[PDB]
């Protein structure tokens, strides 16, 4: 059985693929990678996601069926589709290496632009300088500069409950440089407390399918390893993030 699937690309356009009905996510990602002409090395820098909200998209696990997701969320209105192609990458140096790949630059650029609009990348203090490079479509110079801002290549999650926060929520923020928990209120308004967890402090980590929680165990300073639970509905995505970070740290090819 063949079915069509619509998927959004970082530039706001959509692409349609004719794909087997029970395809898994990687299979659909490979069909999409081919129709837009990603090369053998670009294909490893992007992955399939599901739009959850205006401010959050979630990575599809390997064992999902994108067509099921697509129909579940389909209507005749919509800006288009709930499936989207987004960068999957934590170390910005492997990005710099692709600066002479027009496809990847274009995708990196349009996503970075939209993550600026959304507040993910904190470019405020050079906003005008960045604006000027955007207007002239000097894409690589915009990116080489935006890549120095706070929040570049950081995955921010919706606020939720944490078993080591008696009242209030956390917003978890994940990057190659560390694991941050931001204290926010009940409704998600930021307090002003925050905790940076070094990745080498991360001892082990799990999910809890039934409690719907991600779990991580850290040894910091000198105390004895302690468990923290985050009651996020996206525990699998957050688990994929830990695995991906440790993977990228093992293969970090630069001292800076």
């Amino acid at each position: 059985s063949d079915v069509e699937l619509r998927v959004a690309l970082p530039d706001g356009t959509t692409v349609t693929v004719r794909v087997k009905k029970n395809s898994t996510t990687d299979q659909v990602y490979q069909a999409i990678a081919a129709k837009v002409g990603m090369d053998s090395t670009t294909v490893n820098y992007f992955a399939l996601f599901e739009v959850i909200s205006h401010s959050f998209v979630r990575k599809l696990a390997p064992n999902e069926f994108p067509h099921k997701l697509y129909i579940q969320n389909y209507t005749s209105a919509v800006p288009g589709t709930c499936l989207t192609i987004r960068k999957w990458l934590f170390t910005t140096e492997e990005e710099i290496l692709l600066n002479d790949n027009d496809l990847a630059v274009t995708y990196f650029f349009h996503q970075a632009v939209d993550d600026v609009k959304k507040g993910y990348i904190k470019a405020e203090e050079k906003s005008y300088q960045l604006q000027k490079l955007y207007e002239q479509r000097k894409m690589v110079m915009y990116l080489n500069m935006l890549r120095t801002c706070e929040g570049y290549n950081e995955i921010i999650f919706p606020h939720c409950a944490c078993d080591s926060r008696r009242k209030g929520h956390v917003i978890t923020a994940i990057s190659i440089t560390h694991f941050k928990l931001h204290a926010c209120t009940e409704e998600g308004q930021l307090e002003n407390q925050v905790i940076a967890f070094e990745w080498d402090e991360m001892q082990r980590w799990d999910t809890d399918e039934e409690g719907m929680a991600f779990c991580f165990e850290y040894a910091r300073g000198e105390k004895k390893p302690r468990w923290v639970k985050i009651f996020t509905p996206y525990f699998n995505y957050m688990h994929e993030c830990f695995e991906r970070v440790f993977c990228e740290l093992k293969w970090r090819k630069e001292e800076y």
Binding site: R166, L181, A183, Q193, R226
Partner: peptide
């Protein structure tokens, strides 16, 4: 549980 934001 002990609160990690205890300061």
């Amino acid at each position: 549980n002990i609160d990690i934001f205890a300061d």
